[PDB]
């Protein structure tokens, strides 16, 4: 994979959808805003001032926290706190569920 | 990785596919005309037959041509899951790197 250094700027939690921004000579990361398309997924807790890395790779699927109950095949978007939630507005869809998840459980997703 | 799909209605090899959902398991059928397909059949799959979707993110696909495709042509879904040339962005799912007659397979790079 291709790794690079990035700094959290707002208490990154594991399995949350992440977004990024241009900071002080470094890419800064945080939980993705509600109702959008995320760029990266957390797989480690990284606090507000903590420095970490990002492992680049065209992953087939992500495992993220379900922000609500999810049915197999549901199109997903970002929700509160960077969780993944069911939707129906194409422009905010970043992937879809291949398995059932209850709120708070991990849900595997396939990118689109 | 891969996942179980339940097919939907007579999937043919090399045709462009699209996903849906019903009872539970993701349903697979031929992609509708003039849009962006989700998967390429590697083998024929019966209407209600369960199978696998091999998610090994490919940069290029081998898809049956629905019409005369030239090198560099932008492609979209045609009829019956075949691939056809298009001049209308948003329907584009990739482009050809090969030339093909009709019913021939054509290599295309997804974009």
């Amino acid at each position: 994979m291709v790794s690079f250094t990035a700094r959290a700027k707002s208490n990154v939690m594991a399995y949350r959808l992440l977004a990024y921004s241009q900071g002080d000579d470094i890419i800064e990361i945080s939980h993705a805003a509600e109702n959008t398309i995320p760029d990266y997924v957390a797989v480690k807790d990284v606090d507000k001032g903590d420095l970490t890395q990002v492992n680049m790779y065209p992953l087939a699927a992500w495992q993220v926290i379900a922000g609500s109950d999810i049915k197999v095949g549901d199109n997903l978007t970002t929700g509160k706190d960077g969780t993944a939630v069911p939707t129906d507005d194409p422009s905010t869809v970043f992937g879809y569920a291949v398995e059932e998840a209850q709120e708070g459980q991990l849900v595997t997703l396939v990118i689109s | 990785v891969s996942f179980t799909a339940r097919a939907k209605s007579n999937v043919m090899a090399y045709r462009l596919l699209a996903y849906s959902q019903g009872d539970d398991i993701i349903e697979i059928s031929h992609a509708a005309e003039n849009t962006i397909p989700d998967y390429v059949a590697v083998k024929d799959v019966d209407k209600g037959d369960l199978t696998q979707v091999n998610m090994y993110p490919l940069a290029a696909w081998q898809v049956i041509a629905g019409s005369d495709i030239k090198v560099g042509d932008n492609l979209t879904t045609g009829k019956d899951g075949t691939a056809v040339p298009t001049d209308d962005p948003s329907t584009v799912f990739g482009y050809a790197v090969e030339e093909a007659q009709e019913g021939q397979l054509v290599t295309l790079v997804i974009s």
């Binding site: 990154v12 594991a14 797989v43 807790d45 492992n55 790779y57 926290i65 398995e99 998840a101 708070g104 | -």
Partner: protein, 99 residues
């Protein structure tokens, strides 16, 4: 009457995975769904809906793998819970975000 988790004693690295398996002693002849749940604290360790644990990189605490079956009904909940204990191996060789 019981839910038996597949491995009572597990040992998962930072970032590793472990499948667990729910074994429902249903005394009637009906199907019962197992809710999976992971408690234990430190970081965002969660589990998949079918039982695959994904310990999250900075996990320091002793985990706990719950397996809940709701017998009874709505507003009268009876929650038969199985239990598995996970310790962590410190595989502190990883990154943060991943795409």
């Amino acid at each position: 009457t019981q839910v038996i988790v597949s491995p009572n004693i597990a040992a998962v690295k930072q970032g590793g995975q472990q499948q667990f398996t729910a074994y429902v002693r249903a005394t009637n002849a009906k199907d019962h769904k197992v809710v999976w749940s992971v408690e234990g604290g430190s970081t965002g360790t969660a589990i998949t809906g079918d039982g695959l644990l994904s310990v999250s990189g900075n996990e320091d605490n002793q985990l706990t793998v719950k397996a809940t079956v709701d017998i009874g009904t709505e507003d009268k909940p009876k929650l038969v819970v199985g239990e598995a204990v996970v310790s962590i191996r410190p595989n502190n060789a990883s990154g943060g975000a991943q795409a």
